[PDB]
């Protein structure tokens, strides 16, 4: 037998005993379906944070705000447009806080020009040619 | 019905499939069945085609067990330059029948070994990270340029500066595509005259005679006289086929067997290591039962019957270091992102909402305040403001349960009371609205996990009492009228709040009373036991691995407790707050302008709020810790906690950081992202009004039974667990971390102690970007191999990936830092890669790499020596007399008026274009098209001979007829033309063809020869004739077929590092992996 | 990202013209804001305030945080609308006032109703209230704090203008967003 692959890679006499009976005489008090949906929602894996990381070609794959988006997502999870639990505009001043941005590379420089382009220009700076 | 788990199924013909889950002989993740109702729950894989009343498993569980039914070999033999010769004996004759002669080795003029993993392998869920090597007559450079040649100037060339990284990644991939478990399969008793009585293993498929011939070299007799026949005759016939079987038999098929079949040593060793790791990882259902029962906190008892079996396999037992490392990785994954942590708290809150029996209803407040009304003449009214400010018509109480959920996650997130819930502007005690804002805020603060909550509570009343009461100040720069929202850091706690005596009761009586009340009656932290430490690991740290720290204290749970039990901390807090407020209101010394005497109404409503039927304090005291402990070990993100302190600003945490460097290094300080926070973690605002109303109005159902309720609530939750998949993910993550640190330390200059097998391959000291991209490639290779879509090792990619060890530490206020360094045990992929590199440095020719360096110079000869193995007089070393070394500062000057041009020697002398030179490859890579322009003309006819020293290089072979004129110049110049500064093409060698009959002697022009012996892949030459006369001589390698030829050699004797051996002793298994089952019984 | 250019950037007409080819920039990816309304609001407020103050407040305003204004009717009218359609009355208001609004036979003769009427001021019922006297800075700050800002006067600078009650009583974040007003926030 075989198992399908999820993520692509390298692409190129006998009688019924008296005990048995189907009755469903009991109704769950907490609610099987309710707690079951709740645990299905809760068991979701944590969302991947991929910004600021390099890729196959070495370019930083992050995007060149998060608190406001989280507040909007919380307000959408709730039914009210206003949010009762927010991550933005809170009293604590945390200006110093930094995030994993795509503007910087692993060397500390700016990704104003991608690493691949920078290496290409550096290596094409001095290349020989055939004599005239 | 089934008499093992009481599973009632209506099909009495496939009960065998169900009893096979228990382990009885007559895909599917878990089978949970209750004891008080007929509603079984089934967990099914996430990516199945259809769901038929079955629940998904939202977790990328690694595929650890993968089987293999083919051959456990990765070195195949390919024929090149085929030839056919007459044979004396044509076929085997038995009565009126004939059988063709099948040689186990290819019959050709030249046969050489090449590595090609899983070439004969019938598996399910292929790891797919295969390594493909073409025969050397083709071009094999397409895998030495895989990693860091995205910006190479020329295609079909590879970077000598990145050869080492490419080779390391290739070795890693070779190791990765071998993590398989050998599969036992049926035999077939042979009766051939040469292999009588032996048991030969038959691969599944259409036919197996060809596979028999390939696997068993000794089956072929000695019909003719030849090299293969001589090797077979030298080989012994006693050791072939099955060696011995096991003793446990499930029917007639043996349990495990080991057979004598063709297989290399490296792959069988790797699979043995993998099997040993899994065997030490396995687990049995009785301690699973114990772990579940212990996690259920005694409200639910679990059982799991099973038949006595030995092959049962279910690897989940892991240590605590792996859990701690995975916890560190998950914490680092956040990086001050408010989007990655919001859903976890958001849905844990709703899970607690569905779990908890406490239902919140402000109609209690409405009914208590309905009887309170005020006259038709007076304007201002307490009760109307009370109702309008508590808002008993709003049914959004998510904040209370969000705070309860965030009790578990201090150090990554901190919950604080949101701004604008404080009194407007500075506030004043002369205003009823400001007073009741103070009431709500003070009643709401203790639940929040903010260390500065007592200071905020005191400073709120201080600000409101500005102008009536005075307290001393120290620096004369922070006035008493300083907003309490700013007090969010331990360094701002005033000495007045530190020492109560500094507040004079003759001047600040109410403030003195409030300070004393805060000091005395603030809730005390405690701890509770959760989970099962022994069977499942504990991913918590900075705390002992079996306690859960709670800001509130806990007591044993019984429902028959008085509502106004003032021994309860929260009820005492509410009563004392109300008492102090009414003491404030009595004298009216603080409320001028109130023409009407509001003291009576104020005291009445304060009493009606002090005493009220609210079961929320009792719930938080008794039942909430039990629910939190029940749900803690089952979460995808295990709780991460930091010690709780109250009124002690010496142990208050301030920062949490992650370090990627060892202790015995002084490196450049790179603080993690999580340390850039004013608080200990990400701030999280909370509305105080919802918390206050939830704490003030909560009631139980009028027929609650705790045992029944929790037995009914735990079962559906425990039927949806993913803890085992999380454990497998965690061990995979730790394996990946160890492999990453080893691989990065191999190529980058670090102080990690590793044994460096391969350093002769030229490379460069990788920078941060190069290390990051190499780490990205190894990460994606591991993810592809283990089929994981979610994150793995990505947080380590950010910053400098040249890491040594993972650790996390947190700093308290006074400066004592607590550092936790989880020791990491020996992994499997890391030492398997080290072993395969140790084998590589002795056998580099098989992978297609030639150690040493080449010599460029015309050799007009009629001899038949192989260029890969030249004779001594055609090579010159560094110590050969009369040679000129060359450094970077080599400068060529022309010769005026008919003089020989001269080049600058590294010693400073000038030498003409003639002689024997020693010349590093870097020089030619730098000055091609100039060194080309001159030396190309000079070498072709003159006496100039150049030795290019390069360590290692890929080579492609060219076979020419030794009896015809041949010239290698058109290939040597072709190689020397496109040696661009960024890459070089494979070095072309021109080797002759071994012959049997006498052949004519024709001249040949050779330019490139290797310095040392670089031809070990040559399996055999002319393996059809009795002997070879003209050409390179080579017989079948006896050294590799040890156990057959060596008489005094035990079956388990292998030369692991020096020479890889074929036809080894591979052990095959047959294991069952039953789904996890449990019968969820109840507790009276 | 936010970019400010010296022009009048709308949604449709500015998208059609582009104005990046017009300024020389070779430009989906860019999203265009609208600011004709805020230019008109600047012209309208420039009467009762000072240009420097308005410019400072508006440059302290940021444009990536969507918000909106909402004009409440004057007091007599607000009470009237609430009385006529009383489902709308907010919970925040006091029980006596809301209960007496949910009644018939209301008129000027009522004593305690009038007591509550001129004892009532809009401080509690609508919390962030831009009154007539509010400085330009506070109004802008509020827009940044919350999604909705309540105001009493038409003369406002910000996102939009909506009417809380019927008329008779009154008497897209892409990668790069362009605009025509710089923000230092
Ligand atoms: Zn069963």
Tokens for A56?
A: 């196959």
Rounded to the nearest angstrom, the distance between the alpha carbon of B15 and the centre of ligand 1 is 8
**Residues on chain C bordering chain A, Cβ-to-Cβ distance under 8 angstroms:** 1, 64-65, 145, 147, 175
Tokens for B563?
A: 């509502």
3-state class (DSSP) for residue B632? helix
Work out the number of other CB atoms within 10 angstroms of the CB of residue B1031: 21
- The verdict on whether residue B18 carries a ligand-binding annotation is yes
Question: What are residue B110's DSSP bridge partners?
Answer: B80, B1021
* A-C Cβ pairs (cutoff 8 Å, strict): 7
CA A60, A64, A66: angle at the middle one, nearest 5?
Answer: 115
Residues present in chain C in total: 185
Measure Cα distances from B566 to A91, B617, B700, C50 in Å: 33, 10, 19, 61
Separation CA B425–CA C34 (nearest Å): 35
Asked if residue B180 lies in contact with residue B66, where contact means CB atoms within 8 angstroms, the answer is yes
CA B268, B270, B273: angle at the middle one, nearest 5?
Answer: 110
What would the 3-class secondary structure string for B799-822 be?
Answer: CCCCCCCCEEEEEECCCCEEEECC
- The verdict on whether residue B452 carries a ligand-binding annotation is no
3-state class (DSSP) for residue C71? strand
Rounded to the nearest angstrom, the distance between the alpha carbon of A13 and the centre of ligand 1 is 22
Question: Which of B443, B346, B436, B442 is closest to B391 using CA atoms?
Answer: B436
Separation CA B1012–CA B696 (nearest Å): 88
Separation CA C15–CA C28 (nearest Å): 11
Beta carbons within 8 Å of B721's beta carbon, 6+ residues apart:
B30, B634
Separation CA B126–CA C69 (nearest Å): 61
Asked if residue C129 lies in contact with residue C122, where contact means CB atoms within 8 angstroms, the answer is yes
Work out the number of other CB atoms within 10 angstroms of the CB of residue B889: 10
Tokens for B695?
A: 């704490």
CA C62, C68, C71: angle at the middle one, nearest 5?
Answer: 135
- B931-941 and B969-977 are packed helices; what angle lies between their axes, rounded to 10 degrees? 170
Tokens for B469?
A: 């009461």
Judge whether A68 is closer than 8 Å to chain C, CB to CB: yes
Tokens for B320?
A: 């605590």
Beta carbons within 8 Å of C34's beta carbon, 6+ residues apart:
C9, C10, C11, C14
Residue in B384, B390, B418 to test binding to C, most C beta-carbons within 10 Å: B384
Judge whether A82 is closer than 8 Å to chain C, CB to CB: yes
Separation CA B656–CA B642 (nearest Å): 9
Q: What is the DSSP letter of A104?
A: B
Work out the number of other CB atoms within 10 angstroms of the CB of residue B894: 9
Work out the number of other CB atoms within 10 angstroms of the CB of residue B1006: 23
Asked if residue B452 lies in contact with residue B487, where contact means CB atoms within 8 angstroms, the answer is yes
Task: Give the N- to C-terminal CA distance of chain A in Å, as an integer.
Answer: 65
Separation CA B1028–CA B1032 (nearest Å): 8
Separation CA C48–CA C45 (nearest Å): 6
Find chain B residues with C-beta within 8 A of C146's C-beta: none
Q: What is the DSSP letter of B445?
A: G
- For the CA atoms of chain A, what is the radius of gyration? 29
What would the 3-class secondary structure string for B1033-1054 be?
Answer: CCCCCCCCCHHHHCCCCCCCCC
CA A45, A47, A49: angle at the middle one, nearest 5?
Answer: 140
- B688-696 and B398-406 are packed helices; what angle lies between their axes, rounded to 10 degrees? 100
Question: Which of B947, B954, B922, B950 is closest to B760 using CA atoms?
Answer: B950
3-state class (DSSP) for residue B860? strand
Separation CA B676–CA B657 (nearest Å): 9
Label residue B170 exposed, middle or buried (CB < 10 Å: 0-12, 13-18, 19+).
buried
Q: What is the DSSP letter of C72?
A: P
Q: How far is CA B543 from the centre of its chain?
A: 24
Asked if residue B474 lies in contact with residue B446, where contact means CB atoms within 8 angstroms, the answer is no
Judge whether C92 is closer than 8 Å to chain B, CB to CB: yes
- For chain C, after which residues does the C atom lie more than 2.5 Å from the next written residue's N, i.e. where is it broken? 27, 171
Question: What are residue B414's DSSP bridge partners?
Answer: B683
- For B456, the enclosing helix (H) or strand (E) is helix B453-464
Measure Cα distances from B547 to A121, B538, B541, B640 in Å: 58, 10, 10, 12
The whole-angstrom distance between C54's CA and the closest CA on chain A is 24
Label residue B609 exposed, middle or buried (CB < 10 Å: 0-12, 13-18, 19+).
buried
Instruction: Identify each DSSP E strand in B972-1068 by its residue range.
Output: 987-991, 1004-1010, 1018-1021, 1065-1068
Separation CA B737–CA B328 (nearest Å): 11
Tokens for B555?
A: 């007591």
Separation CA B988–CA B957 (nearest Å): 6
Find chain C residues with C-beta within 8 A of B380's C-beta: 119
- B453-464 and B432-444 are packed helices; what angle lies between their axes, rounded to 10 degrees? 170
Residue of chain B with shortest Cα separation from A127: B981
Task: Give the N- to C-terminal CA distance of chain C in Å, as an integer.
Answer: 13
| CB-side neighbour CA atoms (13 Å) of C92 | 11
Separation CA B954–CA B156 (nearest Å): 12
Question: Which of B954, B945, B949 is closest to B916 using CA atoms?
Answer: B945
- For C31, the enclosing helix (H) or strand (E) is strand C30-32
Q: Furthest-apart CA pair in chain C: how many Å? A: 71
Separation CA B718–CA B292 (nearest Å): 9
Q: Region of B1069 please: left (phi>0), alpha (psi -120 to 50) or beta.
A: beta
Asked if residue B1023 lies in contact with residue B806, where contact means CB atoms within 8 angstroms, the answer is no
Separation CA C58–CA B886 (nearest Å): 70
The whole-angstrom distance between A83's CA and the closest CA on chain B is 9
Asked if residue B397 lies in contact with residue B359, where contact means CB atoms within 8 angstroms, the answer is no
Mark yes or no for CB contact C147/A81 under 8 Å.
yes
Asked if residue B989 lies in contact with residue B952, where contact means CB atoms within 8 angstroms, the answer is no
Q: What is the DSSP letter of C61?
A: S
Chains with 3 or more CB pairs under 8 A to chain A: B, C
Strand order through the sheet with B952-959: B849-851, B952-959, B987-991
Residue in C147, C150, C175 to test binding to A, most A beta-carbons within 10 Å: C147
- B382-390 and B688-696 are packed helices; what angle lies between their axes, rounded to 10 degrees? 110
Burial B307-338 (b: 16+ CB within 10 A, else e): eeeeebbbbbbbebebbbbbbbbbbbbbbbbb
Burial B60-91 (b: 16+ CB within 10 A, else e): bbbbbebbbbbbbbbbbbbbbeebeeeeeeee
Judge whether C116 is closer than 8 Å to chain B, CB to CB: yes
Separation CA B511–CA B470 (nearest Å): 9
Judge whether C91 is closer than 8 Å to chain B, CB to CB: yes
Q: How far is CA B301 from the centre of its chain?
A: 34
| CB-side neighbour CA atoms (13 Å) of B169 | 23
Judge whether A128 is closer than 8 Å to chain B, CB to CB: yes
- For the CA atoms of chain C, what is the radius of gyration? 21
Beta carbons within 8 Å of A61's beta carbon, 6+ residues apart:
A50, A51, A53, A54, A55, A102
Residue of chain A with shortest Cα separation from C176: A64
Residues present in chain B in total: 1084
Separation CA B931–CA B934 (nearest Å): 5
Separation CA B970–CA C71 (nearest Å): 88
Separation CA B66–CA B178 (nearest Å): 10
* B289 phi and psi angles, rounded to 5 deg: -55, -45
Instruction: Name the residue with tokens 């007799």.
Output: B221
Question: Which of B574, B532, B593 is closest to B443 using CA atoms?
Answer: B574
Separation CA C55–CA B891 (nearest Å): 67
Question: Which of B141, B135, B142 is closest to B119 using CA atoms?
Answer: B135
- For B91, the enclosing helix (H) or strand (E) is strand B91-93
Burial C123-134 (b: 16+ CB within 10 A, else e): ebbbebebeeeb
3-state class (DSSP) for residue B124? coil
* B-C Cβ pairs (cutoff 8 Å, strict): 31
Question: Which of B558, B72, B64 is closest to B267 using CA atoms?
Answer: B72
Q: Which residue in A9, A44, A55 is closest to B128 by CB distance?
A: A9
Contacts 24+ apart (CB under 8 A), C145-148: C145/A89, C146/C67, C147/A81, C147/A82, C147/C66, C147/C67, C147/C68, C148/C67, C148/C68, C148/C69, C148/C70
Q: Which parts of B841-918 fold into alpha helices (H)?
A: none
Residue of chain B with shortest Cα separation from C113: B376
Question: Which of B796, B596, B804, B634 is closest to B719 using CA atoms?
Answer: B634
3-state class (DSSP) for residue B480? coil
Question: Which of B521, B524, B529, B596 is closest to B566 using CA atoms?
Answer: B521
* DSSP letter string, B5-24: T----S-TT-HHHHHHHHT-
* A125 phi and psi angles, rounded to 5 deg: -55, -45
Instruction: Name the residue with tokens 């139980």.
Output: B700
- B338-355 and A32-42 are packed helices; what angle lies between their axes, rounded to 10 degrees? 160
Residue in C1, C2, C62, C65 to test binding to A, most A beta-carbons within 10 Å: C65
Measure Cα distances from B570 to A44, B360, B444, B505 in Å: 34, 17, 11, 27
Work out the number of other CB atoms within 10 angstroms of the CB of residue B560: 4
Question: What are residue B1004's DSSP bridge partners?
Answer: B861, B966
- For C68, the enclosing helix (H) or strand (E) is strand C68-71
Rounded to the nearest angstrom, the distance between the alpha carbon of B1081 and the centre of ligand 1 is 15
Residue in B492, B719, B769 to test binding to A, most A beta-carbons within 10 Å: B769
- The verdict on whether residue B547 carries a ligand-binding annotation is no
The whole-angstrom distance between C54's CA and the closest CA on chain B is 24
Separation CA B593–CA B610 (nearest Å): 27
Instruction: Name the residue with tokens 């809170």.
Output: A90
Measure Cα distances from B457 to B414, B526, B800, B1082 in Å: 17, 22, 43, 46
Asked if residue B809 lies in contact with residue B817, where contact means CB atoms within 8 angstroms, the answer is yes
Question: Which of B851, B940, B935 is closest to B892 using CA atoms?
Answer: B935
Asked if residue C174 lies in contact with residue C30, where contact means CB atoms within 8 angstroms, the answer is yes
Beta carbons within 8 Å of B1070's beta carbon, 6+ residues apart:
B183, B184, B253, B255, B256, B311
> In the PDB record, what is the listed experimental method?
cryo-EM
- For the CA atoms of chain B, what is the radius of gyration? 40
């Amino acid at each position: 037998k075989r198992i399908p692959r999820k993520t692509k890679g390298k692409s190129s006499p006998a009688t019924a005993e008296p005990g048995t009976s189907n009755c469903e005489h009991y109704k769950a008090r907490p609610g099987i379906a309710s707690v079951q949906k709740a645990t299905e929602s809760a068991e979701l894996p944590m969302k991947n944070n991929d910004e600021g990381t390099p890729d196959k070609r070495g370019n930083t794959k992050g995007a060149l705000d998060e608190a406001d988006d989280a507040t909007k997502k919380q307000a959408k999870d709730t039914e009210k447009a206003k949010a009762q639990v927010t991550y933005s505009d809170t009293g604590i001043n945390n200006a110093n806080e930094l995030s994993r941005s795509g503007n910087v590379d692993n060397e500390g420089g700016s990704n104003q020009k991608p690493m691949s382009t920078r290496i290409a220009e550096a290596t094409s700076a001095i290349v020989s040619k055939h004599p005239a | 019905q089934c008499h093992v788990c009481s599973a009632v199924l209506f099909s009495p013909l496939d009960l065998d499939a169900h009893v096979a889950s228990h382990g009885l002989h007559g895909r599917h993740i878990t089978e949970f069945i209750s004891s008080w109702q007929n509603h079984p729950i089934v967990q099914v894989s996430a990516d199945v085609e259809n769901r038929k009343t079955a629940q998904l498993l939202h977790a990328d569980t690694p595929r650890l067990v993968t089987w293999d039914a083919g051959l456990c070999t990765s070195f195949k033999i390919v024929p090149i330059v085929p030839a056919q010769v007459p044979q004396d004996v044509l076929a085997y004759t038995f009565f009126t029948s004939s059988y063709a002669i099948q040689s186990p080795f290819p019959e050709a003029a030249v046969s050489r070994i090449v590595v090609h993993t899983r070439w004969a392998s019938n598996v399910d869920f292929d790891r797919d990270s295969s390594v493909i090597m073409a025969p050397p007559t083709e071009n094999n450079i397409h895998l030495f340029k895989q990693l860091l040649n995205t910006e190479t100037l020329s295609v079909r060339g590879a970077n000598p500066l990145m050869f080492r990284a490419n080779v390391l990644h290739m070795l890693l991939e070779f190791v990765l595509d071998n993590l398989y478990l050998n599969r036992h399969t049926g035999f077939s008793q042979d009766h051939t005259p040469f292999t009588e009585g032996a048991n030969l293993r038959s691969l599944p498929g259409p036919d197996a005679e060809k596979w028999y011939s390939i696997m068993y070299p000794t089956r072929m007799g000695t019909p003719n006289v030849s090299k293969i026949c001589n090797f077979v005759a030298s080989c012994v016939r006693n050791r072939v086929g099955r060696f011995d079987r096991a003793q446990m038999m499930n029917g007639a098929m043996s349990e495990w067997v080991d057979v004598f079949e063709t297989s290399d040593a490296l792959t069988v060793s790797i699979r043995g290591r993998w099997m040993a790791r899994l065997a030490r990882m396995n687990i049995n259902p009785t301690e699973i039962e114990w772990a579940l029962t212990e996690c259920a906190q005694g409200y639910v008892t679990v059982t799991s019957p099973y038949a006595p079996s030995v092959n049962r396999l279910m690897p989940y037992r892991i240590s605590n270091a792996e859990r701690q490392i995975s916890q560190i990785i998950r914490v680092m994954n956040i990086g001050n992102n408010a989007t990655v942590i919001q859903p976890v708290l958001q849905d844990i809150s709703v899970l607690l909402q569905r779990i908890s029996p406490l239902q919140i209803d402000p109609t209690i407040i409405s009914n208590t305040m309905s009887t309170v009304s005020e006259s038709t003449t007076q304007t201002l009214s307490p009760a109307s403001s009370i109702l309008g400010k508590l808002r008993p018509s709003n049914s959004d109480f998510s904040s209370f349960r969000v705070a309860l959920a965030g009790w578990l996650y201090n150090g990554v997130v901190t919950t604080v009371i949101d701004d604008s819930s404080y009194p407007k502007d500075g506030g004043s005690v002369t205003s009823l609205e400001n007073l009741w804002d103070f009431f709500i805020l003070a009643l709401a603060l203790p639940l929040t996990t903010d260390p500065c909550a007592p200071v905020k509570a005191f400073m709120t009343l201080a600000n409101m009492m500005v102008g009536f009461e005075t307290i001393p100040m120290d620096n004369q720069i922070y006035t008493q009228s300083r907003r309490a929202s700013a007090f969010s850091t331990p360094h701002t706690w005033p000495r007045c709040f530190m020492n109560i005596q500094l507040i004079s009761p003759i001047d600040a009586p109410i403030l003195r009373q409030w300070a004393e009340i805060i000091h005395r009656y603030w809730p005390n932290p405690s701890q509770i036991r959760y989970g099962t430490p022994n069977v499942f690991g504990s991913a918590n740290l900075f705390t002992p691995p079996e306690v859960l720290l709670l800001p509130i204290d806990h007591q044993p749970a019984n429902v028959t407790t008085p509502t106004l039990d003032f021994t309860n901390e929260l009820t005492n807090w509410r009563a004392r707050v109300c008492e102090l407020m009414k003491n404030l209101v009595d004298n009216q010394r603080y409320q001028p302008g109130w023409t009407q005497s509001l003291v009576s109404s104020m005291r009445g409503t304060l009493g009606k709020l002090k005493l009220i039927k609210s079961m929320t304090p009792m719930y938080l005291q008794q039942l909430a810790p039990v629910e939190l402990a029940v749900i803690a070990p089952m979460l995808p993100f295990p709780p991460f906690q930091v010690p709780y302190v109250r009124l002690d600003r010496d142990r208050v945490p301030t920062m949490v950081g992650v370090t990627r460097q060892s202790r015995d290094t002084i490196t450049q300080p790179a603080l993690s992202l999580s340390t850039t926070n004013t608080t200990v973690g990400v701030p999280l605002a909370l509305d105080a009004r919802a918390i206050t109303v939830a704490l003030l109005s909560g009631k139980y159902p009028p027929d609650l039974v705790t045992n029944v309720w929790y037995a009914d609530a735990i079962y559906p939750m425990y039927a949806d667990t993913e803890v085992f998949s999380n454990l497998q993910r965690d061990v995979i993550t730790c394996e990946a971390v160890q492999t990453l640190v080893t691989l990065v330390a191999q190529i980058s200059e670090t102080q990690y102690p590793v044994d460096r097998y391969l350093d002769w391959i030229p490379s460069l000291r990788a920078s941060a970007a190069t290390a990051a991209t190499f780490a990205e490639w190894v990460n994606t290779s591991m993810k592809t191999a283990f089929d994981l879509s979610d994150m793995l090792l990505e947080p380590l990619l950010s910053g400098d990936p040249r890491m040594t060890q993972l650790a996390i530490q947190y700093q308290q206020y006074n400066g004592r830092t607590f550092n936790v360094i989880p020791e990491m045990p020996g992994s499997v992929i890391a030492d398997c890669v080290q072993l395969t590199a140790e084998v590589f440095n002795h056998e580099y020719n098989l992978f297609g790499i030639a150690r040493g360096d080449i010599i460029i110079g015309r050799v007009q000869s009629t001899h038949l020596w192989s260029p890969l193995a030249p004779p001594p007089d055609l090579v010159f070393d560094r110590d050969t007399p009369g040679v000129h070394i060359f450094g970077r500062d080599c400068r060529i000057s022309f010769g005026m008026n008919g003089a020989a041009p001269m080049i600058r020697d590294e010693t400073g002398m000038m030498v003409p274009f003639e002689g024997n030179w020693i010349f590093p490859l870097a020089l030619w890579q730098m000055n091609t098209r100039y060194f080309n322009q001159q030396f190309d003309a000079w070498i072709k006819t003159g006496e100039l001979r150049i030795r290019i020293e390069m360590g290692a290089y890929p080579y492609m072979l060219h076979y020419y007829d030794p009896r015809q004129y041949a010239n290698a110049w058109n290939l040597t110049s072709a190689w020397l033309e496109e040696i661009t500064p960024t890459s070089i093409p494979s070095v072309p060698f021109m080797v002759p063809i071994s012959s049997d009959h006498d052949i004519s002697s024709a001249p040949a022009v050779q330019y490139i020869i290797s310095t040392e012996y670089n031809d070990r892949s040559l399996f055999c030459t002319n393996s059809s004739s009795p002997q070879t006369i003209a050409g390179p001589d080579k017989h079948i390698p006896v050294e590799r077929y040890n156990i057959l030829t060596n008489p005094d050699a035990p079956p388990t004797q292998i030369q692991l590092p020096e020479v890889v051996d074929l036809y080894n002793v591979v052990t095959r298994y047959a294991y069952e992996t039953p789904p996890i089952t449990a019968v969820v019984m109840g507790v009276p | 990202a936010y970019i400010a250019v010296p022009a009048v950037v709308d949604s449709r007409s500015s998208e059609a013209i582009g104005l990046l080819e017009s300024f020389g920039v070779d430009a989906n990816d860019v999203s265009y804001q609208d600011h004709d309304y805020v230019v008109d609001q600047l012209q309208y407020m420039l009467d009762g305030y000072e240009a420097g103050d308005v410019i400072d407040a508006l440059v302290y305003r940021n444009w990536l945080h969507h918000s909106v204004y909402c004009l409440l009717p004057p007091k007599s009218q607000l009470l009237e609308y609430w009385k006529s359609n009383p489902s709308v009355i907010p919970d925040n208001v006091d029980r006596r006032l809301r209960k007496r609004l949910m009644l018939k036979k209301d008129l000027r003769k009522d004593d305690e109703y009038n007591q509550l009427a001129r004892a009532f001021k809009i401080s509690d019922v609508y919390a962030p209230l831009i009154s007539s006297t509010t400085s330009p800075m506070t109004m802008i700050q509020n827009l940044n704090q919350g999604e909705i800002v309540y105001t009493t006067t038409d003369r406002v600078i910000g996102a939009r203008v909506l009417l809380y009650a019927p008329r008779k009583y009154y008497a897209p974040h892409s990668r790069f967003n362009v605009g025509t007003f710089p923000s230092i926030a």
